[PDB]
Amino acid sequence: IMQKSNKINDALNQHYKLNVELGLVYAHYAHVADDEFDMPYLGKFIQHLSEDKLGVHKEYISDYFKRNGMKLKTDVSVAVKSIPSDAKALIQEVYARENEVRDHVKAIAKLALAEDDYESFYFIQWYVRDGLKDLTEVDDVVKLFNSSNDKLIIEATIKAMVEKEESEHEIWG
Amino acid sequence: IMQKSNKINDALNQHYKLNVELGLVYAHYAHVADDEFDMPYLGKFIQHLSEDKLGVHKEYISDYFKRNGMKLKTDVSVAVKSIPSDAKALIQEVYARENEVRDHVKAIAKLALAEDDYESFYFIQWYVRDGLKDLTEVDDVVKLFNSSNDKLIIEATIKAMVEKEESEHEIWG
Amino acid sequence: IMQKSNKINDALNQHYKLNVELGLVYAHYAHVADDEFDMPYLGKFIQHLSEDKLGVHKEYISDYFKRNGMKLKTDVSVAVKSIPSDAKALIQEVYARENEVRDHVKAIAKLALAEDDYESFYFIQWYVRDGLKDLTEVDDVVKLFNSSNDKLIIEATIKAMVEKEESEHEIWG
Amino acid sequence: IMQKSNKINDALNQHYKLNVELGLVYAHYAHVADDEFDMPYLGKFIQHLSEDKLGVHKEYISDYFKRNGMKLKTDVSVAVKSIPSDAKALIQEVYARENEVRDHVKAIAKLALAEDDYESFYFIQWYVRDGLKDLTEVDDVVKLFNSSNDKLIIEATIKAMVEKEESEHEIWG
Amino acid sequence: IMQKSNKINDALNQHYKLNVELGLVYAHYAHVADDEFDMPYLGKFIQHLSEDKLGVHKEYISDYFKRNGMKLKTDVSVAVKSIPSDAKALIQEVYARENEVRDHVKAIAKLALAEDDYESFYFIQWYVRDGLKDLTEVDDVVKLFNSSNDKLIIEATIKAMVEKEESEHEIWG
Amino acid sequence: IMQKSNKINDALNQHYKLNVELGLVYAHYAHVADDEFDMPYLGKFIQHLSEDKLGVHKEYISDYFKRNGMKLKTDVSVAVKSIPSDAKALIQEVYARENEVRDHVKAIAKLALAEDDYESFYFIQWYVRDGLKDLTEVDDVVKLFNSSNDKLIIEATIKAMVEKEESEHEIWG
Numbered sequence A, B, C, D, E, F: 001i002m003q004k005s006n007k008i009n010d011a012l013n014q015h016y017k018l019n020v021e022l023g024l025v026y027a028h029y030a031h032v033a034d035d036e037f038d039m040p041y042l043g044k045f046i047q048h049l050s051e052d053k054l055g056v057h058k059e060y061i062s063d064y065f066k067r068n069g070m071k072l073k074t075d076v077s078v079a080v081k082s083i084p085s086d087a088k089a090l091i092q093e094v095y096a097r098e099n100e101v102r103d104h105v106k107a108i109a110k111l112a113l114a115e116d117d118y119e120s121f122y123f124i125q126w127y128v129r130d131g132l133k134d135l136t137e138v139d140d141v142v143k144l145f146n147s148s149n150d151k152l153i154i155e156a157t158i159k160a161m162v163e164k165e166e167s168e169h170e171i172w173g
Ligand SMILES: [Fe+3]
Pocket: A034, A040, C140
């Protein structure tokens, strides 16, 4: 009884890989934000997201696997061969990636219910929630690029956003 | 004047890659230590090292590059296809990897002096130092595997090692 | 044994002179920033740099000379006969001067290694480090002039930069 | 109305220059006091005076100029080509320089009253006062050289003088 | 890879021996300072230096050897068969010994760079620095013997020097 | 009257020498305990004993000599040419050395009573006491090697022993 679903194991190993690779992409994007686009705080925002992906987002999968019999796989391939043209497009790319995460997570959740893996549906709930929260954070920054033509005004708004004490929303935080 | 050495840029992009990949290998090795070898604290030791490699060890290279004109490259390929047989061999593998780091760093330092990049020789000093410190930490754990046949005695010694307040040595810490 | 290198003495007397004269140039540039360019905080930034050059940068050379047998020379000649046209060009000039310092320091370090003056190579390490740090601080301000067309937005960003508690970077601070 | 006196501007640019150059001379004299005359505290006394001259004494002129329309000039030429023979003569030279300052300041004050620059006469009052205070401090040290033949007794008296909390006199401090 | 240099091992075993023997010489010199020369505080100064040599100066070599594969050797031979004639000559002898240390350390540093032992060049940096610092401390005392003919005035100056809170210099402390 | 016994002077100069040489042997034995025998805490125990011998045990003899007219002699010869085979034998050797100290001290005490040097018999009482205390501390560690076959269990018992607040016994502490 209680034998691990191989399918969920595969999808979560795939989510582990996505989280690792996203984080590494975000670490380059953070560097470029400062280095090339002169936006040090947009860089700090993206670095914080790199650390989330290469941290908690991956941590929980491994912890879960240790508890249920699922196997971890580490197969990582990532190369940043092109960079977006400007800072607005960089945050817009981050956004697109976050939106894709939401679709990937929906699929793990549908699979769990089809496999009757209720422990796995419970586990995915964190990711269903962080999916929307993480998109909301990124969207808030994207908005600024369409709200000002001054990079320093935007930079100061991001700074304040980063230096806020992160009080969680009751449903989404 | 003050034009970046392309060679150092390449060697440090190579060190960035090594640090990223090592960390990802250590994250799998940490998981296996607990999951398969029943050694949760050896796992925490290796997880702490994964975070060092995917954190500060990589952070400083990027920061340096932002200050001098050097370009960051992100090209990462890693797959954990084989796992060591037991826990002693896992820490012994970590050791071998740390020892190699020391040789790689020696090479960046010799290159800097040959290229007359004194800013770069200064920057590598952190890594010349952490090279020995990181090996010393790992060796201290390896020693235990040859000092006891009881995994729980070893586990308790590692626990204490992890929960020590990390007071830095004057030269090496 | 342990007889002072006359060459290093000369190069460091030359660095002492550069630091004194730079500081005096920065004191005029600070005045002009406020007086003519209406940028009081860019003035405070440059005044802080004047004080660094006419303070610690010179202090250590004299202290070193007192410890090793080297002679101090005081021969100072400086006249500010032309002023840059605008504030962006003023910070850009400061930058150029800081970049030159980095080349001068590289030369003292190469000389020390060639003269086998290891005490002197150790002493120059502060200056190899401050060379990059000081350039990084100036570059951060230059960036702003290309990031906004509003002098008051730039001024407010500089203000915050000056009123930050100066937490040192592990390698460069 | 309220148009700056060109004469006062010139005299104060001349006082700025004197203060800069005096400070640089005092910085060498401080070094020599310790290095050659074995009097580290006489060195600290003179270093404190170097910093006063290259600091507040110059700062106020620039601040004043920013408020009234006067132009700052930076033309500095100084070389220490001869050093006094002993420590008594070094402090005696400092004294002579301070006494000259008092005559220079008297001249700015007489000029202000003749030019009806009452703002400028007010501004010079700090310097009329510091002129006597600064001479008094130096005289107190000179006295010691005629009060003892032991350099270490003198050194200890200077030490105490430097480490006093500097409580200002009601008129002169 | 990373195999210890036998030459550095030998030079550092030689520095270990020098530090042990110097400390033992300083312990006798401290005793004589009080016992024969009636200078208890010069004795405390030299005793503090004995403890530095037989402590940290030796400790770090052993610690280093434990980290890199180098072997420690303990072969100590020292006899104090002659004593200096007076106290000035005793501190002058200490000085000469400290000056020699500086030359010995220069040699370890040149050797490291020739052997491409960058870990060893890093390790020697403490000793390149303490070499000058330790000489500076001793020189400060020697100066006093040429600054007064009263042993009690000198003694009181040494006392204050010993009872100072030892605030480190940024480069040399 | 009150003229120093030459015999006691000789025996105490001999005890000074023994204490210096023992400490240096213990410093090597401490290094070997960690380096070769993988017992870092046995190393700390022996290092603490090295410091006792090269510290207080020697300090008091010199202090005594300064008070009574006795002459200090510094003639030290020590070489560690052989090392014990294992850790049990290392602590057993330390023990043998401590036991010998007890016999040497008995002899100084018998001599004092025969020479009617009551000040010297009083002085030796510290050493009669520390002789037994120091043996007791070492015996407590030796016991462990016959109480367990696990080096890590022994190591943990030593650790606790070292990190105890050293509360003195009424007679022996
Ligand atoms: Fe930045």
